[PDB]
Design an enzyme around this catalytic site. Sequence first.
Site, PDB file in Angstrom:
ATOM      1  N   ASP B 346     -58.005 -50.569  54.619  1.00 49.65           N
ATOM      2  CA  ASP B 346     -57.712 -51.698  55.487  1.00 49.65           C
ATOM      3  C   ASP B 346     -59.036 -52.347  55.872  1.00 49.65           C
ATOM      4  O   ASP B 346     -60.087 -51.699  55.864  1.00 49.65           O
ATOM      5  CB  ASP B 346     -56.936 -51.226  56.724  1.00 49.65           C
ATOM      6  CG  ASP B 346     -56.678 -52.338  57.705  1.00 49.65           C
ATOM      7  OD1 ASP B 346     -55.838 -53.224  57.432  1.00 49.65           O
ATOM      8  OD2 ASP B 346     -57.328 -52.327  58.762  1.00 49.65           O
ATOM      9  N   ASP B 687     -55.801 -48.533  60.863  1.00 51.10           N
ATOM     10  CA  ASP B 687     -55.886 -48.540  62.316  1.00 51.10           C
ATOM     11  C   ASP B 687     -54.671 -49.069  63.085  1.00 51.10           C
ATOM     12  O   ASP B 687     -54.248 -48.435  64.057  1.00 51.10           O
ATOM     13  CB  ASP B 687     -57.109 -49.362  62.742  1.00 51.10           C
ATOM     14  CG  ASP B 687     -56.959 -50.841  62.457  1.00 51.10           C
ATOM     15  OD1 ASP B 687     -56.570 -51.205  61.329  1.00 51.10           O
ATOM     16  OD2 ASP B 687     -57.214 -51.635  63.384  1.00 51.10           O
ATOM     17  N   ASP B 691     -50.099 -50.390  59.194  1.00 50.32           N
ATOM     18  CA  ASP B 691     -50.469 -49.366  58.239  1.00 50.32           C
ATOM     19  C   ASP B 691     -49.516 -48.181  58.304  1.00 50.32           C
ATOM     20  O   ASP B 691     -49.611 -47.281  57.465  1.00 50.32           O
ATOM     21  CB  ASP B 691     -51.910 -48.903  58.495  1.00 50.32           C
ATOM     22  CG  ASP B 691     -52.914 -50.019  58.335  1.00 50.32           C
ATOM     23  OD1 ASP B 691     -52.792 -50.805  57.369  1.00 50.32           O
ATOM     24  OD2 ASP B 691     -53.821 -50.129  59.181  1.00 50.32           O
TER      25      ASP B 691
END
Lengths: 294, 993
Positions: B346, B687, B691
């Site tokens: 990410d 985070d 996700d």
Amino acid sequence: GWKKFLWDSEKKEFLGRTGSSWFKIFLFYLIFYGCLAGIFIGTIQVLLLTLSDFEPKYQDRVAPPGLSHAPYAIKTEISFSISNPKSYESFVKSMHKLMDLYNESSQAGNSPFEDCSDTPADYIKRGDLDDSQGQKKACRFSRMWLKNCSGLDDTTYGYAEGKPCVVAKLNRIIGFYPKPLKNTTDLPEELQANYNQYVLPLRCAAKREEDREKIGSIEYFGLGGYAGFPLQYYPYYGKRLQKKYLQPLLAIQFTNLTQNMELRIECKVYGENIDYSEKDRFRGRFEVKIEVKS
Amino acid sequence: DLDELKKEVSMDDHKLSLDELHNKYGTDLTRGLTNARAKEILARDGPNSLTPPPTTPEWIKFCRQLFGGFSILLWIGAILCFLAYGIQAATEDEPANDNLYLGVVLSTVVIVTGCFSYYQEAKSSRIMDSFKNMVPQQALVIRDGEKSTINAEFVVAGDLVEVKGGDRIPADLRIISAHGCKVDNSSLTGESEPQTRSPEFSSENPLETRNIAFFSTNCVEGTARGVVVYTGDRTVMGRIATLASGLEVGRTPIAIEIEHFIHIITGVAVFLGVSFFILSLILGYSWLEAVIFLIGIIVANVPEGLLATVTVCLTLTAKRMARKNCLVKNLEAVETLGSTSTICSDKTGTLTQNRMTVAHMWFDNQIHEADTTENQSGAAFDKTSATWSALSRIAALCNRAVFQAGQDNVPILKRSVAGDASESALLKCIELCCGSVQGMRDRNPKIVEIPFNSTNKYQLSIHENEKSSESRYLLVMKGAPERILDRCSTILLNGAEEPLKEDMKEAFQNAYLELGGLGERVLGFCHFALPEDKYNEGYPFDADEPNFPTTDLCFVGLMAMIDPPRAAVPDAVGKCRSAGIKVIMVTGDHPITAKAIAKGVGIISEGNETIEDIAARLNIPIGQVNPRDAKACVVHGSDLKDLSTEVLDDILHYHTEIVFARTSPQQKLIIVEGCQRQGAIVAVTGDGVNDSPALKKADIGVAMGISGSDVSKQAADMILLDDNFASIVTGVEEGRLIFDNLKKSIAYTLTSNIPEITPFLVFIIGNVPLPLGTVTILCIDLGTDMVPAISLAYEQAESDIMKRQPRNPKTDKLVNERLISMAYGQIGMIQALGGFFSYFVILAENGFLPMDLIGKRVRWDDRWISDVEDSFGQQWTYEQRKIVEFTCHTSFFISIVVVQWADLIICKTRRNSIFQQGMKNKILIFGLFEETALAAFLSYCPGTDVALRMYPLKPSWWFCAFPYSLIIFLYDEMRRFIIRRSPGGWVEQETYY
Ligand SMILES: C=C(/C=C\C[C@@H](O)[C@@H](O)[C@H](O)C/C=C/C=C\[C@@H](O)C[C@@H]1O[C@H](C[C@@H](O)[C@H](O)C[C@H]2O[C@H]([C@H](O)[C@H](O)CC[C@H](O)/C=C/[C@H](C)[C@@H](O)C[C@]3(O)O[C@H](C[C@@H](O)CCCCCCC[C@@]45C[C@@H](C)C[C@@](C)(O4)[C@@H](C[C@@H](C)CCCCC[C@@H](O)[C@H](O)[C@H](O)[C@@H](O)[C@H](O)[C@H]4O[C@H](C[C@H](O)[C@H](O)/C(C)=C/[C@H](O)C[C@@H](C)[C@H](O)C(=O)N/C=C/C(=O)NCCCO)[C@H](O)[C@@H](O)[C@@H]4O)O5)[C@H](O)[C@@H](O)[C@H]3O)C[C@@H](O)[C@@H]2O)[C@@H](O)[C@H](O)[C@H]1O)CC[C@H](O)[C@@H](O)[C@H](O)[C@H](C)C[C@H]1O[C@H](/C=C\[C@@H](O)[C@H](O)C[C@@H]2C[C@@H]3C[C@H](O2)[C@@H](CC[C@H]2O[C@H](CN)C[C@H]2O)O3)[C@@H](O)[C@H](O)[C@H]1O
Ligand SMILES: *[C@@H]1O[C@H](CO[C@@H]2O[C@@H](C)[C@@H](O)[C@@H](O)[C@@H]2O)[C@@H](O[C@@H]2O[C@H](CO)[C@@H](O[C@@H]3O[C@H](CO[C@H]4O[C@H](CO)[C@@H](O)[C@H](O)[C@@H]4O)[C@@H](O)[C@H](O[C@H]4O[C@H](CO)[C@@H](O)[C@H](O)[C@@H]4O)[C@@H]3O)[C@H](O)[C@H]2NC(C)=O)[C@H](O)[C@H]1NC(C)=O
Ligand SMILES: *[C@@H]1O[C@H](CO[C@@H]2O[C@@H](C)[C@@H](O)[C@@H](O)[C@@H]2O)[C@@H](O[C@@H]2O[C@H](CO)[C@@H](O[C@@H]3O[C@H](CO)[C@@H](O)[C@H](O[C@H]4O[C@H](CO)[C@@H](O)[C@H](O)[C@@H]4O)[C@@H]3O)[C@H](O)[C@H]2NC(C)=O)[C@H](O)[C@H]1NC(C)=O
Ligand SMILES: CCCCCCCC/C=C\CCCCCCCC(=O)OC[C@H](COP(=O)(O)OCC[N+](C)(C)C)OC(=O)CCCCCCC/C=C\CCCCCCCC
Ligand SMILES: CCCCCCCC/C=C\CCCCCCCC(=O)OC[C@H](COP(=O)(O)OCC[N+](C)(C)C)OC(=O)CCCCCCC/C=C\CCCCCCCC
Ligand SMILES: CCCCCCCC/C=C\CCCCCCCC(=O)OC[C@H](COP(=O)(O)OCC[N+](C)(C)C)OC(=O)CCCCCCC/C=C\CCCCCCCC
Ligand SMILES: CCCCCCCC/C=C\CCCCCCCC(=O)OC[C@H](COP(=O)(O)OCC[N+](C)(C)C)OC(=O)CCCCCCC/C=C\CCCCCCCC
Ligand SMILES: *[C@@H]1O[C@H](CO)[C@@H](O[C@@H]2O[C@H](CO)[C@@H](O)[C@H](O)[C@H]2NC(C)=O)[C@H](O)[C@H]1NC(C)=O
Ligand SMILES: CC(C)CCC[C@@H](C)[C@H]1CC[C@H]2[C@@H]3CC=C4C[C@@H](O)CC[C@]4(C)[C@H]3CC[C@]12C
Ligand SMILES: CC(C)CCC[C@@H](C)[C@H]1CC[C@H]2[C@@H]3CC=C4C[C@@H](O)CC[C@]4(C)[C@H]3CC[C@]12C
Ligand code: ALF
Ligand SMILES: [Mg+2]
Ligand code: NA
Ligand code: NA
């Protein structure tokens, strides 16, 4: 999957490898296992060279000696009916197997059976444990010595009319000298009478105080009429140096046995180098359960 | 719970007019619903609350562990063991205690191993509970024309709902009237970017239009009105939460490997049993004995401690990791990082710091770079020119943000600042290399400021001049570089002033495109000294008319800014690529920013090119170039929505440097699946909440800890408590290491099975007395072997593990036939020969020569034969011969320990030599010493021959196993030699684990 991993026809493989692989692996394991076998055999041959043929290196696990008996009773119980003949057959077959080795026909000639004192005597040393004077000589032990339990008169040995016999025997040990108790003020009650130094005494009794009354007359038969083993048959020189050797035997007739009741009879030998064990119930003494149910 | 209907992209009705939307739901735009109609819809649709998952009690899982692994093979035996006791107690024979103390020992083994397997069993996620803590308790609804604050759960579809800056959106709304309202779509986009909600429509995509507020978000500023379109399990982050709680966990590699290992083991156990059954029928034994023999051989081939040993092995590495701030929720996950071949990361919050930071600055016709790293470990930018000072005054004065009260302790970058991200980044840079801005601001009093205007496109203000020799007025203004460029005619060069001729105007254009192409946002700063003769110190410049010269200003220089990457991000990405790990960026961010960070961190190696870059370098359309000449590709989310399965496979199959931009959460899950599909393990590092569906279906999730949320933290398997990305590199080293070690310990525990089963095979075949006893096999398996094998785990590397390519899952296994050929075939065989050697020695020294032992078991076992003739003619009672057999069990067990010495040494290194690696492992040395002390203790302690049946040994026997041990050492040493000198030969494809 199922079919391919079994036989594919492009790489010409069976089970996964080709023809030359199975050969490389088979040859490798043949050479490897062959070397393994040769090494184990060499290490066993050096062992055959270490030990002696006339004497076991360690003799601490067999001392003092045990006390075995014939017949061959399973769980130390002798139970048989006086009517049904097919009840005491397994016993007689054993008794007979044991006595069949003391046949006079076997003991003949000067060798290797020499005539020994008809009355108990002392030890006899035929030299050391060597091959210098060839095969040693052993004393003869006649069947007839056992009076009413010999299978010569009443083949059954007693089981036929409610009077059984028990041939007791001392375990053969190389170089073992039996030592009986001395005449000093300390000696069991029983042993006082007929103290023949040259005889190792054997005496049976009842395990419990109650059973005493229910047990009749214990009649011991042996060499010289005594209830023991003559010291002259010792020591034992081992199979290699004394083939055709006979160990003394003692017959015990349990006359006047109460009918239809389990009787626990414990027999015990006495002597200096004789010691009992609370774990091994055959070391020096032995137990028998007799029940003549008729 | 249709999963496919949850993987599809969301749908909506933002294109309809306000009135039309009401017809679809039934409401009044100015009066809302009636309490009767509102309650009627409360009974029709259900409450506005995310529901809970179905729950699994614990007596269920612990019991599950009881009937698992090979505990089933041990049950057939514990139960069988008792059955015999019941028969003895009911048939009246032996009151002894052998059978029973064994059914109790075997049962105890199963119960304890069950505890060990539970400690390793995946913990039970609380995704939905964390999610549920999201929705606030009370919303503001307008019913019957009145404002009321009611339980959010009582919100239905159709009523009117009002929001205010600071409150959370209680449901999916259709904005009808807003007043400068802004929302934080962090949970859906992945960006702390303040989007604005307007009643008008602006994009065909419902997630991009401003006329829709979304559950799981918050109104940062302003107030707004709307209608409830979605309530409950039907909302967007609601569909994502429902998908997350209902997406399987998977089955880790360590587990699948354990499955394969178990399979192998059970194969040889049933093969040896069927073979000794046919053999027991060719020799004569009855069917009861042949069946009993079969059951004995199978159970005998089960290693009691190898499963629990794998648990202890994994735990020691998890502690080493806990020392470097890397905490793993799942023990099995620990290994997944080393086997990962593709890491999907990410960007915002993971690859970067999510803190706009001043990156580049323009002044004196020269680009200057500033330090954009957390701990400030870099290069200064030459603070010696007057131009920089004037720039500090412009930015530090024309800025309204200020540090939050009480930050006197934290560093200059991690403190809280109230304001926009641009003014905050500027304030931090000035406070960083120019000292306290609070004094810099009180040193010059601000007279009049004209706030940023949508038409003026700039921000200006006038302040007094702190020059004690100049009482004039200072004017400063900032704004877009184009607008500000159109308002200047001078340039502050090295301090003096100069005209704005086209030479510097073109240098300014190239500088603008340089900072712009870098994915950064640039701003222009200029100032001017107001003549105190035309505007005295007493004149007030009210913000109404042209009191300040808009043009003829003095431009000082540009100032760019962007979210920089964490310190060890480039180095870690390079380390992963060096190890053959494919790096792929997946973010819901703008492709310009995503691509810039990709080239800056190493995902898109400098030099590689995209199809658009080639079309721009040649000046030809994009439909002409061939896509095979482009190594790196930037795939957009909008386009990703319209792609087939094969197309994604080809995208990953032909492009080595890929970047997915503007992708939603469902698409994140799709990309991870597109990776696993081919046949590779995947690791996702994130985070935010988007996700969550990517961390659940991945093979291993890595959540940050300091900069993260509670959903990603609870849905991950590994946590990075300090946001130090380098822990990923450490985990890939340790995974491989802890992988190479399990093989050694497994070979060690699989070698002693042979000298443990062969004695019974000789007992039934060759008819010799029993060499090894049951109470000796148990003392070895759970005693001696454990400590040396648990110590094998602490072994160091042989070669650089971070150099080889990731292992293959279909071909390279944990337990292969090459190991079985060593443990069961070569080393264990020698161990068996040594044991039998010591055996024959003990029986030959006491009087039973090897020629007379074959054929004795029938009389050697009988309990009523008190006259057994030996090779010399002696007569042995039953208990006397049994004592010797037990002393043979004791010496056999000691021979096993002696051969295990050389086995632990040859198992220490799989390839390297002992004289190279070295005996630096203190645990292994301690294992050997303890292994010997325990055997001596079990034999020499009084009362052991009573309790465990182990008699003392004479000192000459202890040396019967030494030659076999040395031979084992020499054989394996020459084995590990041809492998080194000859790579790829017979010894390698035949014996290299
Ligand atoms: C608890 C356990 C289980 C047992 C534990 C046990 O120990 C103890 O609990 C004890 O039990 C305690 C229990 C006590 C219970 C009660 C007691 O309290 C009470 C007392 O008990 C006492 C007794 C007690 O004292 C006893 O003795 C205890 C022992 O018991 C076991 C005995 O031995 C044995 O059972 C004796 C019992 C009896 O004998 C059985 C008889 C049979 C049932 C049956 O035959 C009788 C009878 O006929 O049954 C009839 C009923 C019928 O319906 C049944 C139907 C029959 C089906 C026929 C089909 C057969 C079949 C089947 C097919 C699948 C395959 C096939 C091939 O064969 C196929 C072929 C067909 C076509 C055959 C057709 C044949 C037809 C037959 C039938 O028709 C019938 O016979 C027929 O109907 C009859 O009626 C008729 O009469 C027939 O008669 C004849 C039939 C023939 O005979 C018969 O057929 C024969 C011979 C077949 C032959 O095989 C043929 C052969 C020739 C051959 O084929 C041949 O030709 N070869 C030719 C070769 C040739 O040419 N070669 C040429 C060469 C040229 O080169 C005739 O022929 C026929 O025609 C005729 O029809 O079909 C009916 O009722 C009657 O009829 C009846 O009479 C043994 C033990 O159980 C026990 O010690 C009593 O005396 C007392 O009074 C009482 O109070 C778990 C086990 C443990 O886990 C394990 O440890 C175990 O303990 C060890 C394994 C023990 C072993 O080791 C011990 C020492 C140490 C061990 O303990 C250590 O533990 C070792 C361990 C092992 C491992 C490794 C290590 O070390 C340790 C480590 C482990 C740890 O570490 C590990 C990690 N590493 C983890 C952890 O595991 O574990 C030793 O001590 C043991 O001894 C030893 O075993
Ligand atoms: C050790 O000596 C054993 C006894 O020796 C006998 O007595 C000594 C003192 C000498 O006089 C000696 O010469 C004697 O033989 C000896 O065992 C004996 O062996 C013979 C020969 O096989 C047996 O004779 C046979 O007997 C059976 C029936 O036996 C019944 O009684 C015995 C118990 O005595 C039971 O066990 C049986 O089940 C029976 O109930 C006859 O059927 C058999 O007939 C055979 O001979 C006749 C002619 O007479 C033929 O017509 C037939 O066809 C048969 O061929 C025999 O007569 C004798 O029973 C047996 N005695 C015992 C007590 O078992 C033993 O072998 C010697 N061992 C060694 C190593 O020297
Ligand atoms: C083994 O030992 C016994 C017992 O020995 C005696 O006890 C020992 C513990 C120790 O103190 C010895 O010194 C001690 O003698 C031996 O048998 C004993 O022999 C004597 C002598 O014959 C017997 O004593 C006799 O007892 C009779 C009444 O019970 C009595 O009428 C006898 O008279 C005889 O002697 C007198 C002189 O005293 C003489 O005038 C008579 O004309 C007649 O000869 C005599 O006193 C003991 O009763 C015996 N003990 C038992 C238990 O029977 C035994 O001979 C010895 N064996 C060997 C091989 O040495
Ligand atoms: C009293 C006497 C004492 C007796 C004591 C006996 C002790 C027993 C000792 C050892 C037990 C041996 C039993 C067999 C063990 C085989 C191991 C095995 O099955 O492991 C499994 C492997 C899988 O491996 P993988 O995962 O890497 O595959 C990956 C494949 N991918 C990647 C291509 C998909 O499968 C394979 O290997 C394929 C299967 C191959 C099977 C070969 C069978 C050979 C067995 C016996 C031969 C005997 C012949 C004797 C005569 C010789 C001629 C003179
Ligand atoms: C007939 C009888 C048959 C018996 C068969 C079974 C035998 C199995 C038992 C023992 C086998 C011993 C094998 C000896 C191997 C010695 C190897 C050795 O010495 O290689 C030297 C290494 C290499 O150093 P380097 O160059 O990498 O250093 C670099 C340093 N830098 C980085 C600062 C520059 O140096 C090092 O490892 C560091 C120093 C380590 C010193 C180890 C000493 C302890 C050795 C054995 C312990 C005893 C066990 C006894 C078990 C019985 C219990 C009753
Ligand atoms: C590094 C991590 C290590 C993890 C391992 C866990 C550590 C385990 C620690 C302790 C567990 C050991 C328990 C041993 C129990 C022995 C019980 C025993 O001896 O009871 C004696 C009974 C008595 O019988 P009775 O009353 O009829 O006698 C009447 C005699 N009259 C009448 C003649 C006088 O005899 C019998 O049951 C005879 C049958 C003997 C049965 C022995 C069973 C032992 C099974 C496994 C031993 C493994 C432990 C090894 C130590 C490892 C240390 C680390
Ligand atoms: C009490 C316990 C005692 C135990 C003692 C055990 C001693 C026995 C040790 C070894 C004997 C086995 C020798 C087998 C030789 C025939 C094997 C064979 O047919 O192999 C053929 C290959 C040549 O084919 P290639 O690779 O060119 O074809 C390439 C084909 N493709 C692609 C498949 C790779 O051979 C090669 O590679 C060369 C490999 C040769 C194998 C060397 C192994 C040496 C291991 C141990 C010797 C050390 C003994 C120390 C004892 C000290 C006692 C105090
Ligand atoms: C053998 O035992 C019997 C008892 O079974 C003894 O004879 C008994 O003697 C008592 C007197 O004490 C009489 O009342 C019984 O009638 C007798 N019973 C029988 C069957 O004769 C006998 O004395 C014992 N004999 C020996 C030598 O011990
Ligand atoms: C290093 C390896 C390959 C050497 C193996 C050597 C083998 C072949 C040697 C070692 C010891 C040898 C044995 C030693 C003693 C005897 C007794 C004799 O009456 C017959 C030969 C026999 C049985 C030998 C056969 C060959 C033998 C087994
Ligand atoms: C490198 C190789 C060839 C050396 C092999 C050495 C052999 C010959 C040595 C190693 C250990 C030795 C054994 C060690 C202990 C004993 C016990 C003793 O009461 C009799 C001798 C005996 C059984 C030894 C016989 C010789 C022996 C087997
Ligand atoms: F940080 Al975004 F996807 F990259 F969560
Ligand atoms: Mg993020
Ligand atoms: Na094992
Ligand atoms: Na997972």
